[PDB]
Design a protein around this motif. Structure first.
Motif, mmCIF file in Angstrom:
data_model
loop_
_atom_site.group_PDB
_atom_site.id
_atom_site.type_symbol
_atom_site.label_atom_id
_atom_site.label_comp_id
_atom_site.label_asym_id
_atom_site.label_seq_id
_atom_site.Cartn_x
_atom_site.Cartn_y
_atom_site.Cartn_z
ATOM 1 N N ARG B 222 0.826 -1.205 0.000
ATOM 2 C CA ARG B 222 0.000 0.000 0.000
ATOM 3 C C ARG B 222 0.859 1.254 0.000
ATOM 4 O O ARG B 222 0.530 2.237 -0.671
ATOM 5 N N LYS B 223 1.969 1.232 0.730
ATOM 6 C CA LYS B 223 2.859 2.379 0.827
ATOM 7 C C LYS B 223 3.873 2.428 -0.308
ATOM 8 O O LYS B 223 4.819 3.219 -0.236
ATOM 9 N N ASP B 224 3.682 1.609 -1.351
ATOM 10 C CA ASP B 224 4.547 1.599 -2.537
ATOM 11 C C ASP B 224 5.993 1.249 -2.193
ATOM 12 O O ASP B 224 6.932 1.741 -2.819
ATOM 13 N N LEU B 225 6.177 0.359 -1.223
ATOM 14 C CA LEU B 225 7.491 -0.166 -0.887
ATOM 15 C C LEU B 225 7.714 -1.522 -1.559
ATOM 16 O O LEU B 225 6.774 -2.209 -1.970
ATOM 17 N N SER B 226 8.981 -1.892 -1.695
ATOM 18 C CA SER B 226 9.334 -3.149 -2.337
ATOM 19 C C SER B 226 9.037 -4.321 -1.412
ATOM 20 O O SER B 226 9.236 -4.234 -0.200
ATOM 21 N N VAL B 227 8.540 -5.418 -1.985
ATOM 22 C CA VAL B 227 8.409 -6.665 -1.242
ATOM 23 C C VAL B 227 9.257 -7.775 -1.848
ATOM 24 O O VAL B 227 9.119 -8.936 -1.460
ATOM 25 N N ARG B 228 10.132 -7.447 -2.795
ATOM 26 C CA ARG B 228 11.002 -8.468 -3.358
ATOM 27 C C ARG B 228 11.881 -9.054 -2.256
ATOM 28 O O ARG B 228 12.375 -8.332 -1.385
ATOM 29 N N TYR B 229 12.050 -10.377 -2.283
ATOM 30 C CA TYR B 229 12.788 -11.179 -1.301
ATOM 31 C C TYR B 229 12.031 -11.349 0.013
ATOM 32 O O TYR B 229 12.548 -11.982 0.940
ATOM 33 N N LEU B 230 10.810 -10.838 0.117
ATOM 34 C CA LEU B 230 9.916 -11.224 1.199
ATOM 35 C C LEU B 230 8.911 -12.284 0.766
ATOM 36 O O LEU B 230 8.455 -13.078 1.593
ATOM 37 N N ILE B 231 8.555 -12.292 -0.513
ATOM 38 C CA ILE B 231 7.652 -13.270 -1.112
ATOM 39 C C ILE B 231 8.258 -13.680 -2.439
ATOM 40 O O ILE B 231 9.143 -12.986 -2.961
ATOM 41 N N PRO B 232 7.851 -14.823 -2.994
ATOM 42 C CA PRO B 232 8.522 -15.315 -4.204
ATOM 43 C C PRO B 232 8.323 -14.383 -5.391
ATOM 44 O O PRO B 232 7.261 -13.784 -5.562
ATOM 45 N N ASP B 233 9.360 -14.288 -6.224
ATOM 46 C CA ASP B 233 9.285 -13.500 -7.454
ATOM 47 C C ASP B 233 8.014 -13.765 -8.255
ATOM 48 O O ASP B 233 7.373 -12.791 -8.683
ATOM 49 N N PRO B 234 7.587 -15.019 -8.494
ATOM 50 C CA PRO B 234 6.342 -15.208 -9.260
ATOM 51 C C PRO B 234 5.131 -14.586 -8.591
ATOM 52 O O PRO B 234 4.212 -14.141 -9.291
ATOM 53 N N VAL B 235 5.131 -14.480 -7.261
ATOM 54 C CA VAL B 235 4.026 -13.826 -6.570
ATOM 55 C C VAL B 235 4.121 -12.316 -6.742
ATOM 56 O O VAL B 235 3.110 -11.641 -6.984
ATOM 57 N N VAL B 236 5.339 -11.767 -6.649
ATOM 58 C CA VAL B 236 5.544 -10.350 -6.941
ATOM 59 C C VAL B 236 5.054 -10.023 -8.345
ATOM 60 O O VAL B 236 4.360 -9.024 -8.562
ATOM 61 N N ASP B 237 5.404 -10.864 -9.319
ATOM 62 C CA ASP B 237 5.011 -10.607 -10.698
ATOM 63 C C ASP B 237 3.503 -10.705 -10.866
ATOM 64 O O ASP B 237 2.897 -9.900 -11.584
#
Ligand SMILES: NC(=O)c1ccc[n+]([C@@H]2O[C@H](COP(=O)(O)O)[C@@H](O)[C@H]2O)c1
Ligand SMILES: NC(=O)c1ccc[n+]([C@@H]2O[C@H](COP(=O)(O)O)[C@@H](O)[C@H]2O)c1
Lengths: 245, 246
Positions: B222-237
């Motif tokens: 929501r705050k437009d921060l990165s979540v990469r390496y907190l959840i899997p790349d395919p989920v980020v995508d």
């Protein structure tokens, strides 16, 4: 064939006016790389966006030379390979094998002090490549800064490992973004270092996450799972080559 | 096809270890979105089972809850299933069961499935329909089905009204629970009322600190921060492709 400084993900033209171009360098063993090492780059990216006047142009992993006096250090080309596979999906992270390629007169691996590593990045990006083009069309020196966890600042404040001349170069000419998590008390180390307190940025780690490479090697030795602690291609590389027994 | 099929593509139906009771782990949760911590919990449970019990793990199942659970931050069920499925595609033993998200009433609306009925569903599909798990002695046995859960789910079992006492009795007498305890936290008192319904409860200490919760991941999004390496790349995508989590 031969050493080429990696630039395939380096932003060579800025997008934000009034912002200083910034390049982050993580110096470490990376034996093996973990998701925490990778997350530190993303935390630094987020902090820079909302708390500084920098614009991030690249992140580099710099695996230490095999000459480093440390336990559990896999061969350098293996650590470089594991790091490269870890950041292949990343749009902005790259691995620089430079430190693992340094050799003395007799061809043995030679350790590269951190001050000399930062000068190497300064040289390749700013002297060889011509710096970063601004929105004003001016090609500028990118600021180079270290990215490290809290343990690195504590190491820098204890006499014996860091010469005063290197500390002065590292912290006055380059700088350090320091990830601080709960339980770590780095207050005394900042006090002993506050003459550089203006090139030291402390980044609070909001989500607690303390996975170390040492724990990962232990798990590998005890045949415990390391899936979801380090990237899948690194798990496969470690299995394919039998690393860490 | 379009009709529901119980996933078995990573189900181990032949044991490899003598003297072990076959075990299937079921994680009932929201998975909105799934994180690396949810996945780590399966690996921790696998490590615990191998070295501390007389069970042999035969499968790990993610069971995303029905949209009728109606909780804040709960993305649509078909999205959560897709995120879990892609997250777990590289895994050798984890699978996603869309059963709960596919349950519907008469009105075609999502209908909530209580967790006790979820375990009965796994029992039915693995032991009744498929005929169980063959031991190394050639004898076919029922797999033990057990819940895999973090501390928040276990604490909720003590929230009055939330779980029927009869469902808790079924869950804990007939199935069981592997419970991840975060480092520094002591969940024993919350467990006290639950060891009263049989001790089919295994507590797994989490030595590596890790608090990546779905709630924090949504906040960062929501705050437009990165979540990469907190959840899997395919989920980020997937989250970026479909614009989930505002
Ligand atoms: N005087 C120095 O330059 C000095 C001293 C100690 C550590 N270091 C560097 O700090 C890094 C330590 O990495 P690890 O935390 O993985 O052990 C390494 O890159 C090492 O070379 C530099
Ligand atoms: N009476 C019940 O069966 C009952 C009550 C509350 C929660 N639950 C389950 O506990 C899980 C909670 O998951 P999260 O911790 O991810 O939100 C869900 O699978 C939910 O269905 C079951």
């Amino acid at each position: 064939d031969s050493y080429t400084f990696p630039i395939h993900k380096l932003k060579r033209r800025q997008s934000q006016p009034g912002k200083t171009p910034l390049v982050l360098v993580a110096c470490g063993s990376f034996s093996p790389i973990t998701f925490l090492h990778l997350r530190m780059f993303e935390m630094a990216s987020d902090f820079v966006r909302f708390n500084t006047d920098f614009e991030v142009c690249a992140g580099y992993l710099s695996p230490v030379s095999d000459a480093y006096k440390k336990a559990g250090l896999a061969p350098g080309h293996h650590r470089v390979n594991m790091c490269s596979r870890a950041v292949e999906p990343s749009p902005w992270l790259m691995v620089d094998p430079y430190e693992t390629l340094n050799r003395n007169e007799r061809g043995e691996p030679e350790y590269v002090p951190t001050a000399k590593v930062l000068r190497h990045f300064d040289h390749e990006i700013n002297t060889v490549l011509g710096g970063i083009e601004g929105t004003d069309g001016v090609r500028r020196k990118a600021r180079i800064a270290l990215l490290a966890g809290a343990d690195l600042i504590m190491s820098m404040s204890e006499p014996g490992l860091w010469s005063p001349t290197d500390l002065d170069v590292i912290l006055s000419q380059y700088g350090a973004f320091i990830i601080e998590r709960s339980g770590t008390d780095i207050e005394e180390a900042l006090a002993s270092l506050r003459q550089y307190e203006n090139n030291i940025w402390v980044i609070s780690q909001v989500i607690q996450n303390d996975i170390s490479s040492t724990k990962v090697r232990l798990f590998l030795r005890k045949d415990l799972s390391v899936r979801y602690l380090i990237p899948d291609p690194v798990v496969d590389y470690i299995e394919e080559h039998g690393l860490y027994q």
